[PDB]
Structure 1
Amino acid sequence: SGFRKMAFPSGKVEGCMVQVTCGTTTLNGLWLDDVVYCPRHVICTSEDMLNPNYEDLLIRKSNHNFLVQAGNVQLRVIGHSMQNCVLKLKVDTANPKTPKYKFVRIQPGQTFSVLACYNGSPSGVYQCAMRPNFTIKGSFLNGSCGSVGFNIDYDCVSFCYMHHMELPTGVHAGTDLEGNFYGPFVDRQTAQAAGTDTTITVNVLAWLYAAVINGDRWFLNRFTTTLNDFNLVAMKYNYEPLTQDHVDILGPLSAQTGIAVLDMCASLKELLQNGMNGRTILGSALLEDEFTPFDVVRQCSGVTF
């Protein structure tokens, strides 16, 4: 029993964090095998950030300009290349702590753990979700660039995010581990703003199923809805449209609790109309959208209370 925002154990990722220095800029890098991955903006000055020509800035650098520190040891850079917005620094030592890993690009609504780092040293771990507007609501200070997002399914670490910048609203933007940004963002100091954000509907439904599994049914009602009528109501509350894929994905939780997806959709509609009336659901007074259907099955029991 109980339902917490749970992050994956960070040990496999902590053993990959290094510090990358180029000139006066210091940020974090991910050391996997003999390559250190970091944001390419490490080669920039604050002036260069308005309209950097990364190719022009990189051609002027040599291997010895990049200082890489792993713990108290200085690694030797023997090569460098750029792939999209990530810089790949070839080093002369393979990381003996390299876990089994993959680089995966996630979709909005997916969750992941973040190991926030400063000067190549891990400071904290938290759980978060890729918002529908492609930003993340993280907790990052100056020096956190290069910190990574990941999932650990079995013994394999799937790296899905590398932190690059903070937008004016305090939200964060970054890339996958191949250097492709999530969202319409660029690694430039230019007028960029996060688009209007929406609630991840399929995740709120999964979280309502987690509440039913843990014994809470106060919010259920005798109604059902069509998918179309649910979406017409949902979009008036800035909720993402619920697709037939989402309904299919909620199938296992529907079978376990005995509540049809469109029946749970009707309880969500009523919650949006009435509010909570002083009550809570899993210790929260708001509808939670940062637990996927997969997170709920992983964390919750297989037997409904």
Structure 2
Amino acid sequence: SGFRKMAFPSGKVEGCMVQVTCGTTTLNGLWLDDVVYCPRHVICTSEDMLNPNYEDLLIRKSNHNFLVQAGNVQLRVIGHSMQNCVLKLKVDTANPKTPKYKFVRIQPGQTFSVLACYNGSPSGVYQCAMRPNFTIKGSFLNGSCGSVGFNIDYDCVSFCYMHHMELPTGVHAGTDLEGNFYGPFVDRQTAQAAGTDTTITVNVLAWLYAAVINGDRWFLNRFTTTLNDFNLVAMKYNYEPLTQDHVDILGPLSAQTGIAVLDMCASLKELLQNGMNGRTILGSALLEDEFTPFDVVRQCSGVTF
């Protein structure tokens, strides 16, 4: 019993975190095989960030301008190139701790673990969701750039996020490991803002199934709804539309609890229209949307890595 915001074990990623320094800027890098990946803004001064020409700034740097420190060992940079908003530093040593890995680009609503790092040293691990507005509500301070997000699918680390920036509302923006930003953000110190966010409906439903599995049933009711009527309600409350794919994905949880997906939708509709009336669900007074259906099944079945 119990249901916690749980991150994947971070050990496989901790063994890849390094410190990258270019001039006065120090941030984190991800060392996989003989390449260290880091935000390309490591080459910029604060003034360069106002309007950077990354190709021009990079051509002025040599391999020795990049200092890469892995623990108490200085790695030798033997090559450098840029791929979108990521800088790839070829080093003369393959990381002996490189796990089985892939680079995957995730969709909004998908969750991942973040290993927050400073000076190439992991400081903490937490679970995030890619918001529908493509930001993450992370917890990052200055020096955290280059920290990565990941999932583990069997014994393979799927890296999905690299941290680049904090927006004025305190939320975060980053790229996949191919350097493509999530969201309409640019790696420039210019006016940028998170768009209006919405709630990840399929995740709220998954979490309501987790609450039922854990014995919290007060919100269940005799009613059902159609997908069309439920989506009218979802639109009204700034909830993401629920698709037939989401309904299909919730099938296993629906079968385990005996509550049809549209029956759980009728509970959610009632919660949106009336609130919780002083009650909580899994210790929360808000509807939680940062657990996917897969996270719920995984946590309630004890999948190991």
Please identify, of 140-149 and 252-261, the stretch whose mean Cα deviation from structure 2 is larger: 252-261
Gaps in structure 1 of 5+ consecutive residues: none
Distance in 2 between the 1:128 and 1:223 partners? Answer: 32
Q: What's the CA shift for 1:39?
A: 0.1
CA contact (8 A) 1:231 1:241 kept: yes
Distance in 1 between the 2:41 and 2:70 partners? Answer: 20
Please identify, of 135-144 and 245-254, the stretch whose mean Cα deviation from structure 2 is larger: 245-254
Q: What's the CA shift for 1:189?
A: 0.7
Deviations 1:219-251 (A, max 9, x none): 011111111111111111111111111111111
Q: What's the CA shift for 1:181?
A: 0.3
Size of the alignment, in residue pairs? 305
Distance in 2 between the 1:41 and 1:240 partners? Answer: 33
CA contact (8 A) 1:213 1:304 kept: no
Where in structure 1 do 4 or more consecutive aligned residues deviate above 2 Å?
Answer: 301-305
Aligned-CA RMSD value = 2.2
CA contact (8 A) 1:16 1:97 kept: yes
- SS of the aligned residue for 1:300 comes to helix
Against the structure 1 CA distance between its residues 206 and 75, is the aligned structure 2 distance closer, same or farther, given a 3 Å change threshold?
Answer: same
Distance in 2 between the 1:222 and 1:46 partners? Answer: 59
Deviations 1:237-285 (A, max 9, x none): 1111111111111111111111111111000000111111111111111
- SS of the aligned residue for 1:232 comes to helix
Gaps in structure 2 of 5+ consecutive residues: none
Against the structure 1 CA distance between its residues 304 and 21, is the aligned structure 2 distance closer, same or farther, given a 3 Å change threshold?
Answer: closer
Q: Which residue of 2 aligns with 1:217?
A: 217
Distance in 2 between the 1:287 and 1:47 partners? Answer: 42
Q: Which residue of 1 aligns with 2:156?
A: 156
Distance in 2 between the 1:253 and 1:139 partners? Answer: 31
CA contact (8 A) 1:202 1:292 kept: yes
Please identify, of 244-253 and 84-93, the stretch whose mean Cα deviation from structure 2 is larger: 244-253
Q: What's the CA shift for 1:304?
A: 20
Q: What's the CA shift for 1:302?
A: 9.4
CA contact (8 A) 1:148 1:162 kept: yes
Distance in 2 between the 1:146 and 1:231 partners? Answer: 38
How many percent of aligned residue pairs carry the same amino acid?
Answer: 100
TM-score (normalizing by structure 2)? 0.98
- SS of the aligned residue for 1:247 comes to helix
Q: Which residue of 2 aligns with 1:36?
A: 36
How do residues 101-116 of structure 1 correspond to structure 2 at under 5 angstroms?
A: 101-116=101-116
TM-score (normalizing by structure 1)? 0.98
Q: What's the CA shift for 1:301?
A: 4.3
